[PDB]
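Exercise 7. Given the components listed, write out the predicted structure of the assembled complex. Treat all entries as one system.
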Amino acid sequence: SNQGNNQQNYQQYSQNGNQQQGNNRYQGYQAYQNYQGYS
Amino acid sequence: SNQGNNQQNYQQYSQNGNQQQGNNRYQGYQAYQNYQGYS
Amino acid sequence: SNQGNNQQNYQQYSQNGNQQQGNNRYQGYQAYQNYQGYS
Amino acid sequence: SNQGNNQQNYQQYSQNGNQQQGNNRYQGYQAYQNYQGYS
Amino acid sequence: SNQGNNQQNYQQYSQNGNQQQGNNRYQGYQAYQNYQGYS
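Answer.
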């Protein structure tokens, strides 16, 4: 609970990489040639 | 609950990468040649 | 619940990447040559 | 529930990528050569 | 429930990508050469 001054900077840069900006809560889980360049 | 001044910056940059800006809650889960350039 | 001043910036940039800006809640789940450039 | 000043910016840019700006709730699920450039 | 000042900006830009600006609720589901440029 922000009761003041809050600034947050979220930058994600990848390649073939899954990206999540968030939270994950688990209550009951059962489981079993590219070119990129930046100038 | 924001009771003040809240600024948040969400930037996601990828390639072949799934991107989610959010939260995930699990209550009962059962499971079993590209070119990109930025100037 | 925003009771103040809230500004949020959501930017997603990808290629062949699925993009979701939101939340996912699971209550009962059972499961089993491109060119892009930016100037 | 927004009780104040709320501004949110949602920008999604991709290629062959499915894009959703929203939430997904699952209660009972059973499952089994392009050129693009921006100046 | 917006009880104040709410402004939201939804921009989706893709190619061969399905785009949805909304929410999806699942209660009982059973399942089994283009050129584009922007100046």
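Discussion: The longest strand of chain B covers residues 5-13. The interface with chain D takes residues 2, 22 of chain B (CB under 8 Å).
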